[PDB]
Amino acid sequence: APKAKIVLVGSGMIGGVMATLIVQKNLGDVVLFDIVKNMPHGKALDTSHTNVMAYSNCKVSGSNTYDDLAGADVVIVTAGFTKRDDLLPLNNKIMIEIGGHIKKNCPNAFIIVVTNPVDVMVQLLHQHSGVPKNKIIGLGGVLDTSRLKYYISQKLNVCPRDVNAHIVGAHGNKMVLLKRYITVGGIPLQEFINNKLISDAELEAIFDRTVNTALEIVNLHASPYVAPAAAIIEMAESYLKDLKKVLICSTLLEGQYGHSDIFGGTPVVLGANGVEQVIELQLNSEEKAKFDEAIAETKRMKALAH
Amino acid sequence: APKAKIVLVGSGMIGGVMATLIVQKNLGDVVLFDIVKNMPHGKALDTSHTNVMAYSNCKVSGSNTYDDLAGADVVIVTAGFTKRDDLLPLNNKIMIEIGGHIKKNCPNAFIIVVTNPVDVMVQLLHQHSGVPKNKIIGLGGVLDTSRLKYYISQKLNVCPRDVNAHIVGAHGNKMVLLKRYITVGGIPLQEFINNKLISDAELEAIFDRTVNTALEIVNLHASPYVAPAAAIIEMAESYLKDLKKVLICSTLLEGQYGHSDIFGGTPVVLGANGVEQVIELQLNSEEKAKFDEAIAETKRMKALAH
Amino acid sequence: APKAKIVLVGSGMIGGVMATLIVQKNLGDVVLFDIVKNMPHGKALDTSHTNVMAYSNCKVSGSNTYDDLAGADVVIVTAGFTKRDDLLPLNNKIMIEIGGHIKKNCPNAFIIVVTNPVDVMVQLLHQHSGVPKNKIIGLGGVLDTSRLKYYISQKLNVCPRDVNAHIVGAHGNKMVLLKRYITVGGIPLQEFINNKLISDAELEAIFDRTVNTALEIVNLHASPYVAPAAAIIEMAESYLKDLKKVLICSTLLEGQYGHSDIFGGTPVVLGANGVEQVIELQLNSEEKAKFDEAIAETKRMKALAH
Amino acid sequence: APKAKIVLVGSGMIGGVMATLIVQKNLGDVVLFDIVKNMPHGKALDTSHTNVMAYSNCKVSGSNTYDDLAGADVVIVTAGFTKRDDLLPLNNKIMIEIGGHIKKNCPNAFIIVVTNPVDVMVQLLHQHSGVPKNKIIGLGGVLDTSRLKYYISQKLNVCPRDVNAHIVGAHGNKMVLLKRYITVGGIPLQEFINNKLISDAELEAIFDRTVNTALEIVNLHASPYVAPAAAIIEMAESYLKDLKKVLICSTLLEGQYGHSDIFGGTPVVLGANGVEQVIELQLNSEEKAKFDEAIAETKRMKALAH
Numbered sequence A, B, C, D: 001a002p003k004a005k006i007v008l009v010g011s012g013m014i015g016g017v018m019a020t021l022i023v024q025k026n027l028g029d030v031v032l033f034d035i036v037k038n039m040p041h042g043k044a045l046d047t048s049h050t051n052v053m054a055y056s057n058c059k060v061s062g063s064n065t066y067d068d069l070a071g072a073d074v075v076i077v078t079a080g081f082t083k084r085d086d087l088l089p090l091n092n093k094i095m096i097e098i099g100g101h102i103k104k105n106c107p108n109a110f111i112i113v114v115t116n117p118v119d120v121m122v123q124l125l126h127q128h129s130g131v132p133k134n135k136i137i138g139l140g141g142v143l144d145t146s147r148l149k150y151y152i153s154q155k156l157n158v159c160p161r162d163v164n165a166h167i168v169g170a171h172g173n174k175m176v177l178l179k180r181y182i183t184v185g186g187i188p189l190q191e192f193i194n195n196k197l198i199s200d201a202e203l204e205a206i207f208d209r210t211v212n213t214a215l216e217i218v219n220l221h222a223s224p225y226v227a228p229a230a231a232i233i234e235m236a237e238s239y240l241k242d243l244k245k246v247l248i249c250s251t252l253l254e255g256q257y258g259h260s261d262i263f264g265g266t267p268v269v270l271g272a273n274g275v276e277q278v279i280e281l282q283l284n285s286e287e288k289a290k291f292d293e294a295i296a297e298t299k300r301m302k303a304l305a306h
């Protein structure tokens, strides 16, 4: 049938929440693919039963065979080592292997890369998979901004979705948080600062907390995978349902912000044709300087990956 | 049971779409109240069957008795003559009658007034119902801005919800459209103008179309009730589910924009305590002048109503 | 884009609720087509604004041109005179005209016929449109059973969806209500009768009320269109999302119940390939006798239509 | 605010999926409580960010303090050792501790027990918490039947939700699968057997697979928590939204099936008053014999627990 087929290359914790959410949303049939024997079959089985509770009809199957990429409409890559620069060349080899299978089996698939550092790994996969530049993106800004939006919303006592914000350049510690592009119910945050509903010092603390959220969660003896999963699914859904949402993602830069031949975080429009638009924020020189540091770091790590 | 009870005072076209949507969203039990004998019972019956299709369990009942206001959590008033200044005193008498029944039967209800001109009728109902100022609002800005947001979104090829905009002061022809407070994916619209993705002249046409939308629909031999209904339900849902959405509604001004003792359109925060916050936009003198004209017109009509 | 295109041939009351629901559910782009000049454009405009409230991105456009059928994935026909056997030949001519346009413009569309008497009009459209037998159905059983299910659920104080029931043969006054195939939470209704939670006499009253529901609503000075609309959308959604729901619809019989070369109501499975399965209930002789009377009446009216 | 407060006593894998789903569904504020220091705070933080993606406004907080039970509307207990009869007295002590805190802090809460063996642990908690018999249930039948329903649905190529089935007596290996109470689109499964769409031998294999599903998943090197979580949330939602769904759960028997003073699995109706109805299936002597074996085993383990 013409249900979408969504292959999750990597069936760890992020993969398991993604599968759950796809069934909840009835977005398409799911393949949980992993190198680990049998585990993806077990998670798939568990997840499949939830069709009953969710009033859905999505197949959820496990896979240890790359050829199950055949016919994929969407491919979401979480596979890779996480236990530092030394992992860069190992994760490059994984992107290479996956890219070759995408090129062979599903060259028209829309690809979302999650493996860190994402702004590096997405470009490596782009290059090895051969897909068009509008058909591959990395998870970054939707996740990082979810934190900033959420934290401001709790301070202001408003619905989380009503705070909008932009974090660009790269995922990770060089992420560029743009104070000037925060709004609350579409109103500039500065009005709420002028009114003393939130202070500059509070926002600085919230910015630091945002940058350091993954660390804060790890130091609490948990690990971040629920928000990453939800962010990816928001992206995947925008593509699949042709919503044309403006979502901040890692995408190929072709001159925006003065940068070419590299991937970086920026608002894009995701619909049925993939990345339909790349939006270039009209950054000032001070914001562009931080954007430049983010790109420099992506480049440093990209060189080590080879 | 502690399901919310939602009484629709007026069971015309807007009332019928509201009932449908409440069932679709499983928001609470519905009473379709009207002065017209038997018709609300028929619409209620029709609507009740949709619980099966929607997987919901909301009672939908008709009523020709004001005492069915008893126990209402939410009251939505669409009743009133629509077939001009001459209707003002007639509609005042209807607000008076309804207000007396609210005071008697459901003084703790959250009230949404729709009857036009809304910025007048809401204050009349406020005064006769005796409810607190945080417990009554009028439909205006959510509906007017839905048009502006939608039209920009189609020009820019982005998800409609990703355009945010502010229209304040009053509903109707003196509505104040604030170009400066339009954003796209949280980005100032001016960036899209600077980039030539949309022109100033296009936006002027879209503003005119926005102001004149109800007229445009009437002149096409239809009448606006689906968007009005959806806008009201977004408001009602924010209250019922304590979402704390920032939504532009007609609310009592107590000094904001230099105005007191009158209702006017402005962003508010709607949650479990009703109007939790009134947000005052930091308008410039030119925007404040148009806000003043809107209020003057509400006042002119309020005087004729008595 | 590969969003589904859904053309509503007829933009009256049922058409307007269908458009609303499609946007609410983000099911696809909508064309409101009608013979009446300009009205469908006005309803379409009104409906389009609700994308903002619903977080959807469905185009809603009006049409007075049959060639807008081009590219339709789903076509829903409500057009036809309702103001009796004399209307039969007039409505035949309308089905003929529509069928010719479907054959020309969208021969691979999935078709849902609503125009009454539906078990006649669906076969007339089938014959003139040339579509495959698995690609056209009529609204009947989902709507009639929604009433029976709802009324039992209110008596038993259970969730409406948890009552399941079968009404077969035809829509309208010869509909066959099958007491033996009613369940509550998957349990035979007879257990609830044995327990005295519901009596045989109560059920007889509920059966009569079911058969006479459209009349009951009309006699209350309303008209049935909200439940019809929701029922159609449940059918359309099952097709579009490949849900494979078991839904009772008017479909071509090829020997089931002893009948061929005629359409009649029976459970079918609706998924991406249209009618994937026709389910033949193992009726006893007394139930088959009533099924036969329903078919006889469809045949009597089909003869008058030509 | 009058948002529901839902405390998850136990923040392991099932707890983490439950929190995710509550946010997705905007069902209420969540407390992830656990004995383990800091981990629930980390999962809570991760989960909280998803409010942005989900358009929700649910607080998600961690807790290592039992007094955070105060004001709970719903309490879901997953805490307990899983690494056999020897764990019975340890898990009894945990139920005792939790029960004392419920009695003190939230005696009007609706309680769902998950800890295994559930039909034992639920009664232990009932006894120590002091709550009314209509306010505490155990997870069993919704989960076990999700498997049976799902597996039949895939064989028959129908929507999973359209298969309904009953598994009673107890959760675990003595669960009673009732072939006679399986339906497909409300039609007796026997009709599909008579038609050769599914064989008796196939169903026997599906029954075995159902009983052994948790084992099958564990033997695939995964563990069951996604379906358990979804099943619990379906139950919790029915209560919170007063849906009055018929759901098979472990509940106090007071003579049904010849059993008193023990908990066992049976269809109940869950709404705003908790267990509003206990439905007693009219089992035959052969089915009652298996129901008796299930109860005997619950009793054997209950004796060892003390």
Ligand SMILES: O=C(O)c1cc2cc(O)ccc2cc1O
Binding pocket: A116, A117, A118, A143, A144, A171, A172, A173, A213, A214, A224, A228
């Ligand atoms: O959640 C995040 O934002 C995050 C970010 C990063 C960044 C990075 O460079 C490595 C690993 C992670 C892991 C994560 O969970």
Ligand SMILES: O=C(O)c1cc2cc(O)ccc2cc1O
Binding pocket: B116, B117, B118, B143, B144, B171, B172, B173, B213, B214, B224, B228
């Ligand atoms: O849809 C609208 O915006 C609208 C606005 C107004 C304003 C007014 O003053 C009278 C009537 C209507 C009716 C309407 O449908």
Ligand SMILES: O=C(O)c1cc2cc(O)ccc2cc1O
Binding pocket: C116, C117, C118, C143, C144, C171, C172, C173, C213, C214, C224, C228
């Ligand atoms: O709602 C119905 O069931 C219904 C049924 C029928 C049957 C019929 O033969 C003509 C018209 C209608 C109109 C309706 O609204």
Ligand SMILES: O=C(O)c1cc2cc(O)ccc2cc1O
Binding pocket: D116, D117, D118, D143, D144, D171, D172, D173, D213, D214, D224, D228
């Ligand atoms: O998933 C199940 O059905 C299940 C059932 C049982 C039964 C039991 O007695 C112990 C543990 C489990 C764990 C589980 O995951």
